[PDB]
Design a protein around this motif. Sequence first.
Motif, PDB file in Angstrom:
ATOM      1  N   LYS A  38     -41.124  18.434 -13.305  1.00 32.74           N
ATOM      2  CA  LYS A  38     -39.984  18.387 -12.938  1.00 32.74           C
ATOM      3  C   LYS A  38     -39.634  17.995 -11.304  1.00 32.74           C
ATOM      4  O   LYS A  38     -40.449  17.286 -11.061  1.00 32.74           O
ATOM      5  CB  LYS A  38     -38.959  20.334 -12.596  1.00 32.74           C
ATOM      6  N   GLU A  78     -46.600   4.529 -16.339  1.00 32.79           N
ATOM      7  CA  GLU A  78     -48.019   4.896 -16.805  1.00 32.79           C
ATOM      8  C   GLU A  78     -48.199   6.473 -16.571  1.00 32.79           C
ATOM      9  O   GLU A  78     -48.318   6.975 -16.117  1.00 32.79           O
ATOM     10  CB  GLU A  78     -48.928   4.513 -16.375  1.00 32.79           C
ATOM     11  N   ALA A 113     -50.217   9.840 -17.796  1.00 29.15           N
ATOM     12  CA  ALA A 113     -51.978  10.178 -17.708  1.00 29.15           C
ATOM     13  C   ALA A 113     -52.221  11.691 -18.205  1.00 29.15           C
ATOM     14  O   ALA A 113     -51.600  12.199 -17.314  1.00 29.15           O
ATOM     15  CB  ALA A 113     -51.854  10.509 -15.265  1.00 29.15           C
TER      16      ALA A 113
HETATM   17  O1  LIG Z   1     -44.378  12.572 -12.909  1.00 31.30           O
HETATM   18  C1  LIG Z   1     -45.043  13.227 -13.620  1.00 31.30           C
HETATM   19  N1  LIG Z   1     -46.639  12.681 -14.588  1.00 31.30           N
HETATM   20  C2  LIG Z   1     -47.054  11.870 -14.358  1.00 31.30           C
HETATM   21  C3  LIG Z   1     -46.588  10.899 -14.638  1.00 31.30           C
HETATM   22  N2  LIG Z   1     -47.401  10.163 -14.928  1.00 31.30           N
HETATM   23  N3  LIG Z   1     -47.574  11.029 -16.458  1.00 31.30           N
HETATM   24  C4  LIG Z   1     -47.311  11.601 -16.050  1.00 31.30           C
HETATM   25  C5  LIG Z   1     -48.042  13.219 -16.007  1.00 31.30           C
HETATM   26  N4  LIG Z   1     -48.240  14.099 -15.646  1.00 31.30           N
HETATM   27  C6  LIG Z   1     -48.421  15.215 -16.707  1.00 31.30           C
HETATM   28  C7  LIG Z   1     -49.237  16.415 -16.999  1.00 31.30           C
HETATM   29  C8  LIG Z   1     -49.398  16.905 -18.328  1.00 31.30           C
HETATM   30  C9  LIG Z   1     -49.891  16.163 -19.024  1.00 31.30           C
HETATM   31  C10 LIG Z   1     -50.970  16.515 -20.812  1.00 31.30           C
HETATM   32  N5  LIG Z   1     -52.031  17.595 -20.113  1.00 31.30           N
HETATM   33  C11 LIG Z   1     -52.730  18.091 -21.583  1.00 31.30           C
HETATM   34  C12 LIG Z   1     -53.495  19.028 -21.245  1.00 31.30           C
HETATM   35  O2  LIG Z   1     -53.557  19.600 -20.506  1.00 31.30           O
HETATM   36  C13 LIG Z   1     -52.923  19.444 -19.492  1.00 31.30           C
HETATM   37  C14 LIG Z   1     -51.428  18.244 -18.869  1.00 31.30           C
HETATM   38  C15 LIG Z   1     -49.737  15.076 -19.245  1.00 31.30           C
HETATM   39  C16 LIG Z   1     -49.360  14.206 -17.578  1.00 31.30           C
HETATM   40  N6  LIG Z   1     -49.032  13.432 -17.487  1.00 31.30           N
HETATM   41  C17 LIG Z   1     -45.000  14.539 -12.455  1.00 31.30           C
HETATM   42  C18 LIG Z   1     -45.526  16.103 -12.380  1.00 31.30           C
HETATM   43  C19 LIG Z   1     -45.778  16.800 -11.631  1.00 31.30           C
HETATM   44  C20 LIG Z   1     -44.382  17.105 -11.471  1.00 31.30           C
HETATM   45  F1  LIG Z   1     -44.074  17.785 -10.571  1.00 31.30           F
HETATM   46  C21 LIG Z   1     -43.377  15.146 -11.228  1.00 31.30           C
HETATM   47  C22 LIG Z   1     -43.645  14.720 -11.950  1.00 31.30           C
END
Ligand SMILES: O=C(Nc1c[nH]nc1-c1nc2ccc(C[NH+]3CCOCC3)cc2[nH]1)c1ccc(F)cc1
Length: 263
Positions: A15, A85, A87
């Motif tokens: 969010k 991208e 992550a």
């Molecule tokens: O844009 C955001 N995130 C990302 C940008 N690029 N990639 C991401 C991203 N966030 C996440 C969070 C979780 C995961 C999956 N992973 C699985 C294992 O446990 C931990 C979470 C992937 C991901 N990519 C973002 C993140 C957090 C915020 F509050 C608002 C925006």
Amino acid sequence: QWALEDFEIGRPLGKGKFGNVYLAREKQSKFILALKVLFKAQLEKAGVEHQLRREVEIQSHLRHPNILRLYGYFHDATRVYLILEYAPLGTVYRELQKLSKFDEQRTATYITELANALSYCHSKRVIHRDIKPENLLLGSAGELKIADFGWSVHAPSSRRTTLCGTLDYLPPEMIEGRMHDEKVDLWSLGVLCYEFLVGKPPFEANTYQETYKRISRVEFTFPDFVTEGARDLISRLLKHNPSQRPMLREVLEHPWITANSSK
Ligand SMILES: O=C(Nc1c[nH]nc1-c1nc2ccc(C[NH+]3CCOCC3)cc2[nH]1)c1ccc(F)cc1
């Protein structure tokens, strides 16, 4: 260039006031990425549109392993789309709640990765200013990736202020409304570093007003388990005076870094 119908939207990644980021796959490339969805609506209302297309500027012409790629953008009627991208390993924030504290070797590494990331950035007279755990993503290698170049800015500058924002990572100069250059980011790195080891940032308070004092007076203390080299580097980072703050290079070279920086 791109459009919404080019994607398959996946699960919500998180969010933010202006919208959500979603996982998404590029339809004919099968490429995985993240889609940050921003409503024009709220960007104008809350007069930030200026920032957007600057976050886009900077984070676009930027290329670094330790900086979240921005592939592009687009919009329609209702909203603007940011093709980010993706992550795999979530946020450092989340890993922090998860682990409560990081160890010296994990911390060091991040600092390194962070340093170099920032290094590249200053070189282009780009200053991030808003480096906090919530803004740090992890690549699959488990590596740091600085996201969010919203507040990001050129030159040595003076910002359009507005107080309403978490001070926890702001340096005295910024907060005091003063002359601030690229030295901010080293103050940040210090806070970041302290938080990694101790689990909260060194200037934490319960009120905007108290923190302001705390930051302004550089009031911080180390729990016992914080090692000496740690204390040293943090202490060196957290000088009221921008000028006394090491050069990034010195941070890489610091003996507590290199003793511990796995990566
Ligand atoms: O844009 C955001 N995130 C990302 C940008 N690029 N990639 C991401 C991203 N966030 C996440 C969070 C979780 C995961 C999956 N992973 C699985 C294992 O446990 C931990 C979470 C992937 C991901 N990519 C973002 C993140 C957090 C915020 F509050 C608002 C925006």
